[PDB]
Design an enzyme around this catalytic site. Structure first.
Site, PDB file in Angstrom:
ATOM      1  N   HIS A 187      -4.075  -3.545  -7.648  1.00  0.00           N
ATOM      2  CA  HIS A 187      -4.581  -2.126  -7.756  1.00  0.00           C
ATOM      3  C   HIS A 187      -3.713  -1.361  -8.718  1.00  0.00           C
ATOM      4  CE1 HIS A 187      -5.582  -3.380  -3.548  1.00  0.00           C
ATOM      5  NE2 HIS A 187      -6.768  -3.094  -4.068  1.00  0.00           N
ATOM      6  N   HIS A 237       5.092   3.565  -8.580  1.00  0.00           N
ATOM      7  CA  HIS A 237       3.951   2.957  -9.269  1.00  0.00           C
ATOM      8  C   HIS A 237       3.266   4.102  -9.996  1.00  0.00           C
ATOM      9  CE1 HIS A 237       2.505   4.667  -5.520  1.00  0.00           C
ATOM     10  NE2 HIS A 237       1.423   4.990  -6.227  1.00  0.00           N
ATOM     11  N   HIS A 275      -0.716   5.596 -11.580  1.00  0.00           N
ATOM     12  CA  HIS A 275      -2.172   5.605 -11.740  1.00  0.00           C
ATOM     13  C   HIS A 275      -2.525   6.065 -13.147  1.00  0.00           C
ATOM     14  CE1 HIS A 275      -2.507   5.596  -7.232  1.00  0.00           C
ATOM     15  NE2 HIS A 275      -1.325   6.190  -7.376  1.00  0.00           N
ATOM     16  N   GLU A 320      -4.140  11.677 -10.669  1.00  0.00           N
ATOM     17  CA  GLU A 320      -4.760  11.888  -9.342  1.00  0.00           C
ATOM     18  C   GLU A 320      -4.740  13.400  -9.028  1.00  0.00           C
ATOM     19  OE1 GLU A 320      -2.979   8.864  -6.566  1.00  0.00           O
ATOM     20  OE2 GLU A 320      -4.962   7.952  -7.095  1.00  0.00           O
ATOM     21  N   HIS A 336       4.223   7.954  -9.137  1.00  0.00           N
ATOM     22  CA  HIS A 336       4.449   8.308  -7.724  1.00  0.00           C
ATOM     23  C   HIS A 336       5.728   7.581  -7.341  1.00  0.00           C
ATOM     24  CE1 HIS A 336      -0.045   9.346  -7.028  1.00  0.00           C
ATOM     25  NE2 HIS A 336       0.679  10.327  -7.553  1.00  0.00           N
ATOM     26  N   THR A 357      -2.822   8.070  -1.264  1.00  0.00           N
ATOM     27  CA  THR A 357      -4.057   8.194  -2.091  1.00  0.00           C
ATOM     28  C   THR A 357      -4.852   6.879  -2.229  1.00  0.00           C
ATOM     29  OG1 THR A 357      -3.028   7.698  -4.235  1.00  0.00           O
ATOM     30  CG2 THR A 357      -2.991  10.077  -3.390  1.00  0.00           C
ATOM     31  N   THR A 358      -4.308   5.801  -1.611  1.00  0.00           N
ATOM     32  CA  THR A 358      -5.053   4.564  -1.447  1.00  0.00           C
ATOM     33  C   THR A 358      -5.163   4.190   0.014  1.00  0.00           C
ATOM     34  OG1 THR A 358      -3.040   3.136  -1.647  1.00  0.00           O
ATOM     35  CG2 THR A 358      -4.364   3.574  -3.636  1.00  0.00           C
TER      36      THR A 358
HETATM   37  N1  LIG Z   1      -0.634   6.396  -4.121  1.00  0.00           N
HETATM   38  S1  LIG Z   1       0.519   6.902  -2.983  1.00  0.00           S
HETATM   39  O1  LIG Z   1      -0.136   7.937  -2.159  1.00  0.00           O
HETATM   40  O2  LIG Z   1       1.808   7.255  -3.639  1.00  0.00           O
HETATM   41  C1  LIG Z   1       0.810   5.546  -1.948  1.00  0.00           C
HETATM   42  C2  LIG Z   1      -0.275   4.891  -1.387  1.00  0.00           C
HETATM   43  C3  LIG Z   1      -0.109   3.784  -0.581  1.00  0.00           C
HETATM   44  C4  LIG Z   1       1.176   3.332  -0.321  1.00  0.00           C
HETATM   45  N2  LIG Z   1       1.303   2.204   0.500  1.00  0.00           N
HETATM   46  C5  LIG Z   1       2.534   1.466   0.638  1.00  0.00           C
HETATM   47  N3  LIG Z   1       3.600   1.670  -0.186  1.00  0.00           N
HETATM   48  C6  LIG Z   1       4.701   0.923  -0.192  1.00  0.00           C
HETATM   49  N4  LIG Z   1       4.741  -0.147   0.553  1.00  0.00           N
HETATM   50  C7  LIG Z   1       3.761  -0.489   1.341  1.00  0.00           C
HETATM   51 CL1  LIG Z   1       4.166  -1.919   2.230  1.00  0.00          CL
HETATM   52  C8  LIG Z   1       2.545   0.267   1.405  1.00  0.00           C
HETATM   53  N5  LIG Z   1       1.319  -0.028   2.197  1.00  0.00           N
HETATM   54  O3  LIG Z   1       1.014   0.921   2.835  1.00  0.00           O
HETATM   55  O4  LIG Z   1       1.004  -1.121   1.859  1.00  0.00           O
HETATM   56  C9  LIG Z   1       2.291   3.916  -0.912  1.00  0.00           C
HETATM   57  C10 LIG Z   1       2.094   5.078  -1.703  1.00  0.00           C
HETATM   58 ZN   LIG Z   2       0.136   6.509  -5.978  1.00  0.00          ZN
END
Ligand SMILES: NS(=O)(=O)c1ccc(Nc2ncnc(Cl)c2[N+](=O)[O-])cc1
Ligand SMILES: [Zn+2]
Length: 258
Positions: free
Chosen positions: A62, A92, A94, A104, A117, A196-197
């Site tokens: 993703h 990471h 987007h 986003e 992020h 956000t995922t």
């Molecule tokens: N796009 S965002 O809102 O910054 C965002 C969205 C989903 C996650 N999920 C996770 N992040 C780190 N490790 C694990 Cl292990 C997971 N997980 O839940 O797999 C982290 C950050």
């Molecule tokens: Zn993110």
């Protein structure tokens, strides 16, 4: 048929597996700068990344994650709107298929080319898995990218991408310094939101910096050469891996600045 970013499995389908997708505190959101109230009780954000220890970089089908050793008290975010101490676990991005889209969060409906992020978990919950089950479990620092000048501190990430082209590939990625991804100013907006995922958990204090960083057209082009598919599968370029803005509902966005 798991979730992703396409016609058949993109954001607009997520609520069927993840009903919280239609929840009361979903992210991202449009940041209406005229309506965000300056809050003199907010503190300067404290970003303490000098001792950050990166371990690896992973294409998870993703996005790509740069992962940190969060076993010790190293890279922490505090102050700002936060109570207590949140430890960096990964970052990471987007990004879009074109420079006109990819972020986003939006700012008065403006979409940036990409959004970084930096993900941190509240140390009061012991680890990330427990932290995501709590309303104050995560603090995500969001930073917009625009296309212009190159970001020298990004180049190490760009260069390793051709080694993790496809879903499930990883590479050791040590000694990466995330201070090189920060803009000058730490002025920010903040609001209570979610991942956000999927699983889209409502566990995040969002802190979105006002000042974007600039990256070059060549840097973002290399993001776009990644693949969502695994090795030996038909190629699907990793682009447009962003969730659109969601309803603000009963929330106030606060500004740290006049
Ligand atoms: N796009 S965002 O809102 O910054 C965002 C969205 C989903 C996650 N999920 C996770 N992040 C780190 N490790 C694990 Cl292990 C997971 N997980 O839940 O797999 C982290 C950050
Ligand atoms: Zn993110």
């Amino acid at each position: 048929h798991h979730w992703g970013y396409g016609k058949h499995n993109g954001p607009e389908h997520w609520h069927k597996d993840f009903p919280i997708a239609k929840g009361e505190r979903q992210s991202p959101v449009d940041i209406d700068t005229h309506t965000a109230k300056y809050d003199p009780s907010l503190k300067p954000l404290s970003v303490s990344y000098d001792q950050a220890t990166s371990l690896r970089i992973l294409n998870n089908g993703h996005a790509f994650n740069v992962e940190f050793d969060d076993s010790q008290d190293k890279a922490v975010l505090k102050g700002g709107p936060l109570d207590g101490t949140y430890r960096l676990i990964q970052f990471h991005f987007h990004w879009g298929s074109l420079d006109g889209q990819g972020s986003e969060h939006t700012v008065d409906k403006k979409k940036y080319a990409a959004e970084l992020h930096l993900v941190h978990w509240n140390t009061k919950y012991g680890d990330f898995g427990k932290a995501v089950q709590q309303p104050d479990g995560l603090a995500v620092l969001g930073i917009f990218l625009k296309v212009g000048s190159a970001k020298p501190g990004l180049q190490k990430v760009v260069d390793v991408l051709d080694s993790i082209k496809t879903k499930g590939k990883s590479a050791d990625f040590t000694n990466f310094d995330p201070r090189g991804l920060l803009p000058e100013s730490l002025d920010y907006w903040t609001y209570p939101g979610s991942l956000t995922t999927p699983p889209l958990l409502e566990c995040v204090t969002w802190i979105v910096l006002k000042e974007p960083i600039s990256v070059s057209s060549e840097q973002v082009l290399k993001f776009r050469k990644l693949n969502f598919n695994g090795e030996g599968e038909p190629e699907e370029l990793m682009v447009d891996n962003w969730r659109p803005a969601q309803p603000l509902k009963n929330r106030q966005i606060k500004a740290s600045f006049k």
